[PDB]
Symmetry: D2
Subunit: 440 residues, 4 copies
């Protein structure tokens, strides 16, 4: 599954339809990024640039020109063909092949952008630009506007209005096309296979980073080269650190390990968290905490649908958590009073759900307290957790337990579809899986 040229074009046209006549929208590529000295990190295209292009080169700018209500056209600035640079560093699309390949009207050399951009903006009323995202892009846009402002003797005029296109584009990204959902479904499946592998490979004495290695190999083999974020493998007390990425410790017989990891497949993020016993068997204390977190997730999965909200579902999770913690003596008092004082917060200190898409923490307006009413086409994580610090004032057997269980869902007309349920989460199914692997 992928996103095709025709869909990138549909997105460009949908933006244009929203644009004022006599306007241009500018979308800039991500800069290349130094890792050390002359070596660079593997390139990651800007999500919004990617969303409108499917083009994975730096030094590129998409310009959408809406001349008036019927006439519009696109111009790509991108790197010129250059035999020597390409022998050294890789092939470039160039100007001749770009219009056909990407579905744009014209292509120009990025080296000419300062000579050409002001000419494209001349006489327009509005420029749509995401100011403050990249410094290099701001310099280019501001130089172009300065040329026009100062060029009245040359009969040049600057647009007087600049509009941030991000609110509108991010609203577009919040509602996935069926094709986007198919890509996310594959991302979820790939990520699930990786987490299943990790459970099946995990043994006491292995290092946390070994499970990261298994996960990343599995992503790669299905054609998801890179993770969507830095893989978290938190065993024992490390599971109480939300984004623990050192992954440097030897995994101990008797500890849990919390794995939070996701692939990036055609630009789209998977994100799964599973927590399981390193030795294949939950202790009673671990199982008692696990059951509360699992009930939280299972209830959320039942509830998520059009017409509810992350806030409303969060309210149910909080009650499940407070009740469970009271039953175990981790909290003390009256459940409703405890809820009213947000007494769960020491143990569950993050949100239940975030949007998911081209970014793992995806774009889109949440509403105050994530109160926004859910609609079909929205994609989100569901990731309840409980983290009992090694020094917490709680019954001793619970100290140093960090559990999170996370699935990715798409809201549908009939509820939600779970994209990641092909990796097990019921404790008996986790145990059976690991018992089977441990017998091989």
């Amino acid at each position: 599954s992928e996103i095709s040229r025709q869909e990138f074009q549909r997105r460009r046209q949908a933006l244009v339809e929203q644009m004022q006549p006599g306007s241009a929208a500018l979308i800039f590529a991500a800069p290349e990024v130094t890792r050390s000295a002359d070596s660079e990190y593997p390139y990651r295209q800007n999500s919004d640039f990617w969303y409108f292009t499917g083009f994975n080169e730096p030094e590129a700018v998409l310009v959408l020109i809406k001349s008036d209500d019927t006439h519009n056209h696109s111009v790509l600035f991108n790197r010129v063909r250059d035999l020597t640079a390409e022998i050294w560093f890789g092939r470039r699309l160039g100007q001749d092949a770009a219009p056909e390949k990407l579905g744009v009207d014209r292509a120009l050399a990025f080296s000419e952008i300062n000579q050409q951009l002001y000419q494209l903006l001349n006489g327009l009323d509005v420029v749509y630009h995401a100011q403050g995202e990249y410094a290099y892009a701001d310099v280019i846009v501001n130089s172009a506007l300065e040329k026009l402002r100062k060029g009245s003797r040359q009969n040049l005029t600057a647009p007087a209005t600049m509009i941030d296109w991000r609110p509108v584009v991010h609203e577009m990204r919040l509602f996935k096309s069926p094709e986007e959902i198919a890509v996310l479904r594959r991302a979820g499946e790939i990520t699930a296979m990786a987490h299943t592998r990790a459970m099946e490979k995990c043994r006491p004495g292995m290092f946390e980073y070994h499970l990261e290695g298994e996960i990343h190999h599995e992503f790669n083999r299905h054609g998801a080269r890179y993770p969507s974020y830095n893989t978290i493998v938190g065993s024992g007390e490390n599971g109480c650190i939300l984004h623990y990425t050192e992954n440097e410790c030897e995994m101990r017989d008797g500890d849990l390990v919390l794995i939070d990891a996701g692939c990036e497949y055609k630009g789209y993020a998977g994100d799964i968290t599973r927590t399981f016993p390193v030795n294949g068997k939950f202790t009673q204390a671990q199982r008692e905490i696990y059951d509360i977190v699992l009930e939280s997730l299972e209830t959320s999965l039942r509830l998520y649908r059009p017409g509810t909200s992350i806030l409303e579902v969060t309210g149910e999770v909080v009650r499940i958590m407070v009740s469970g913690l009271v039953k175990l003596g981790i909290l003390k008092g009256d459940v409703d009073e405890l809820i009213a004082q947000n007494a769960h917060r020491p143990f569950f200190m993050h949100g239940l759900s975030h949007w998911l898409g081209l970014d793992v923490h995806d774009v889109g307006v949440y509403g105050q307290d994530r109160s926004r009413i859910l609609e079909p086409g929205m994609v989100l994580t569901v990731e309840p957790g409980l983290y009992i610090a090694p020094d917490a004032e709680v019954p001793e057997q619970y100290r140093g337990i960090g559990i999170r269980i996370e699935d990715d869902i798409v809201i549908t007309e009939t509820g939600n579809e779970n994209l990641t349920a092909s990796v097990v989460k019921k404790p008996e199914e986790i145990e059976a899986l690991m018992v089977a692997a441990r017998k091989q």
Copy 2:
């Protein structure tokens, strides 16, 4: 093998010994780097900061103060302990534990650097600073100096002299300690195992990125989490692109695949290139080119020693290449005339050797044309190659062949030691290895 606290301290003292009395040297940590939106790439410490600290956190500065010829001391600025930030993002060393852990005299909060740095530089004659490396560091240094310059009413004085410490530090890095060599030896072994695995796993129909996956898994399993540079897997015509990293094509029965890949182990780079038949058997045309490149490498390995140079050894390689290409009809004319016109350059367009260490293209002065006389303790790559473009005006059977074979060596008193010779390169040994794997 690793570099210990005591060695980081020896390096700090060696720098201090080179510093003028009444001076301070400032070494800044690498900034964290955005991958997309709020996600960051996995952190890579600045090589020089790492060289003097072994400390893998951002928002840190090492200050070495040489008060005079007998008195000197160190101050680390680093992130404060912060319960909430650490629950979210990971543990911090903090100020209390830093002196003992790193072997510095004092530690201060990085948040206080602007209030404290000028006070440390006040009244000194010289500040050692690597200007133009990081913008954030330059702002900090320039602000501190401006406070002092403008603070005579407060009896403050700025050093009048700024010296770039990089020439001296990079000369230090050019000569490896025995401990550094042991770490590089392990990096070479780990990288070799990965390349051996790739040859043993490779089959027609697999994608280039699959071999990258095998390689990276093998790095990880020996505790080298990250590559030292972006892995190159160039099959067929892709082998003619020096840094081909798309690794997106299906590998064809009948093509060669060139793999250029290396781990980063305790900060140090491995870098191996091996080229081999995708189907386990060189064609005659492929073997004819391969033999020239192999002779180039084998001769270089025999020759490299104290008292020669990369330039001198390059001269021998060029003769081997020109002679071989004439014998195959790829070049035409008299060998010595061809050499005099650098007729090999279309086919071998890069250098034979670069320094290797904390960076894959490591620091240190090469001399004009890499003429510098080699001495024990220097570490370098040896990476001859021949690249025949798919449209080259040469006998047709050679078109689209790209071959590189690269080992990592350390110069010793008796010659060189080869750190990477545990992965095969003789064509008959490559074939035997792949034949054996292909029978399983």
Copy 3:
């Protein structure tokens, strides 16, 4: 004559009336400007900031908030009262006295602008900002918008639209109020008195800068402390340099001197040019060139009215010039052919008229080739000139003559009023004036 508080308020309200509901307009003060080391040039307020405030302090920002179609209010950021700073450097308005004194609703300390501005912009749809004028202002605006963009967890929202208020404000400035015209009338009178003094004081052997001294003293004595631009006193060949400001030469018996100078009175520019004989008597060659330039000005003064344009009047001047130069043998050929080839351009290389107001080259749209149709309330210069270079290929007696004669006019319903006609320009009246002064 001045501009009162009530008029500054009328201007603020007129801008607000043009603003979208749910918007804020930001107008920043000019930075103070270094002359040398710790000394600064005398402060000049930003013209647009001045236009809306009449407030002559740095470190100030006017914020006009249009909450909706009926509710709006103003906030001034300005320097706090500070006993020590004021003992040293002068009185400050402060926050307590500002609302009454300036006619704004609220005043806040400029030191609090970064803590307060984002709160004022929060939840607005539009911010009106003149981007690229001052770097410091851009930093403030961009920081505020970044706080809001990144502050959704705090329920903050950034306006998505930024509009340059300059096109609208500069259109306001292009049409003078009767009060503005009265101030300009006084500026013109003051400037005229200064030019009359210069003619009456001028003698051979005096330096060009001496006439600058007389002019500036006369400005000062009528309460116009500073010139509106750097005074030009170009004698002999120096008169052929349009903005000659060195004013360093001894004025020679037999040469002309061209004086281009104007006061700044309550923020408004005068601008007069007069050219006259240093020794009080035009030579024949000088008088021949002078008469053409004078006819140009006199004809322009007759023609300027509502419904014509600078371009149309320029066409008449060009014909007068080409005809006159042909008659003197400076040009050769047919007048209409000469006009068609813009043959006057070597000798008259600048425009006839520019707008005049708070800036000497005042703001406002000219139209292509200054074709805009004139309307009552517009104020402009009329400044024909002829400059014959010392090496020009023309009859020898004309070489090194530079003559410009300039008046300031306001377009009225019945034509124009001449603000500067109280200093003489007819050659016989210049001579009579100087003869009289030279007898004292």
Copy 4:
């Protein structure tokens, strides 16, 4: 009196003599500075650039190259001749005439500085640069060094050492040549004539700015076009503001007026303060304060010599002031106790003396508390004052009195020479001067 080409050359050579072999010193011109919109303030050359060149154009850089201990040479970058730019804006020296005119070895176009500077610095050990003075200069220097650092493949090398030349150059500027003293003597005389004129012109009902007008006219007529700093004319309570420059009030019969003003003559500052009765007659209260300030100045003038210090002389002034204020009942207590508690500070809150030269607050090291031992050739102001605030808790008749009296002196082998004593300061001589003028 002026500074000639030969002296600028002597200064360049003296700097070179202090420079390391294998080094270059870079001295940049001042940027042009906006007054409003497209108008600029009259150009003021950077003092240090001026000190080494006598060249009053922007877009210029002096490069002093010391190749080794015997060979050195100079290169000027400056604006190219350009017929059109010069017709518009004034003559340029250009490259052809610069070597002879300024006494430099070579001249290059400023537009070529980025193509040429790195080539001049290539292979040098040291670059002398005043970092943080001008942003544009820092960009140029840092770009050049970056080219060299990154240009080893082109056999380029950057100097590793940057030294601030300001400490050494400012020490040079602190000790005036006889020629510099002659120029300062003329500046002092010109400034004195201006202050004498102000006393002779001053009448009740005139505005403070009128005296500024008289002063500036007098500067101009002696060929000092511009003041060395913004003229202060503080009458009544305004005299208690140290740098009162509004000069906007009507001067009242019965008030004092404090005038602090100085010309700039060939780059060098005069600085005189005189305080006198607006109506020509000190009241008793005014005379009582005046006498203390005058005794302070007269004693300072007697004492200043080689071997004392500003601090030591300040101690004498403080005793005179405390004693006088006790005698008048403005202070109460024991003189020595009052001195020990710095009880004079409310009334005398600034220093007694600052260096004087190309800047009014001239460069040079003062020592802690201005303790530096005075030597011949140093030039300084002597400016005691007493300022009694309108709300001070003191006998009522003293409120709103601000008096300062300032002369400029040069330290000599036999004491000091007073450069400004040709304007009167004894109260009876002030009165007699004004009585005489008031009878005309």
